[PDB]
Structures are given as C-alpha cells and as structure tokens.
Amino acid sequence: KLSEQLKHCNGILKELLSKKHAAYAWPFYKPVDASALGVHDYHDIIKHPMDLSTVKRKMENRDYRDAQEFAADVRLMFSNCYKYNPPDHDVVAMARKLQDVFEFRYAKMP
Numbered sequence: 001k002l003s004e005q006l007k008h009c010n011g012i013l014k015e016l017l018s019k020k021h022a023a024y025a026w027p028f029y030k031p032v033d034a035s036a037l038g039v040h041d042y043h044d045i046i047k048h049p050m051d052l053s054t055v056k057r058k059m060e061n062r063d064y065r066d067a068q069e070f071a072a073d074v075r076l077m078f079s080n081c082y083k084y085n086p087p088d089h090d091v092v093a094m095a096r097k098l099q100d101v102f103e104f105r106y107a108k109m110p
C-alpha cells in the first residue's frame with residue numbers, strides 16, 4: 001500500500017490523466033515514439049525519457065520510494081519536452097499548463 005504522501009501523489013496523477021486536462025495533457029500520455037514522429041535525434045538529446053504511462057506504471061507497482069521520486073519523474077517528463085523543443089512550440093505551452101497543475105497540487109501535499 002501507499003504512504004500518505006504517495007497517496008496524495010497518486011491523486012495528482014489521477015488529476016493529470018483526467019478528462020478536464022486532456023486537451024493539453026494528451027502528448028504526455030505515452031512514451032515519445034521518435035521513429036513514428038520522424039524525430040531521428042530525439043534520443044540523442046533526451047537521455048532519460050519519461051511520460052505519464054510510465055509514472056502510472058511505477059505508481060501502481062509501488063516502485064516509488066517517496067514523493068520526491070515521483071516529483072522528479074514528473075518534472076523530468078516536462079524537462080525533456082522543454083529541452084528538445086523551442087519555446088514557442090505548441091507542445092511546450094501544453095507542458096507548462098499541465099506542469100502548473102502538478103506544481104500547485106504538489107505544493108499542497110500534507
């Protein structure tokens with residue numbers, strides 16, 4: 001079973017995956033498929049890929065040791081997006097909007 005802080009984190013994850021954020025969260029649902037997107041240098045630039053399905057798998061299987069490990073993975077997912085893409089890219093605006101949800105909810109962790 002999950003700790004109280006990791007239960008709060010699981011609630012954040014549920015919110016990030018919910019329909020109310022779907023219009024900007026959907027790029028982050030699954031691992032970036034660099035070959036399908038035709039982005040041949042993605043894994044040259046991004047050393048440690050991350051996405052919400054991976055965070056969800058780790059949460060369900062109780063892989064996270066604590067809330068800070070969860071937060072590191074979520075921030076890594078957003079960081080990779082910023083690292084690869086230019087600042088005016090549509091996916092960067094989606095990432096910042098979803099990250100604002102995460103950061104506000106994470107700051108309210110009891």
Ligand SMILES: CC[C@@H](C(=O)OC)[C@@H]1N=C(c2ccc(Cl)cc2)c2c(sc(C)c2C)-n2c(C)nnc21
Pocket residue numbers: 026027028032033034037039042080081084085090091
């Ligand atoms: C791989 C580098 C980016 C790119 O393809 O170069 C233009 C890429 N962009 C898109 C993207 C493009 C436009 C919109 Cl509106 C939404 C998403 C995207 C993902 S995952 C996904 C299923 C998609 C459609 N992605 C994440 C996450 N980080 N970078 C990206």
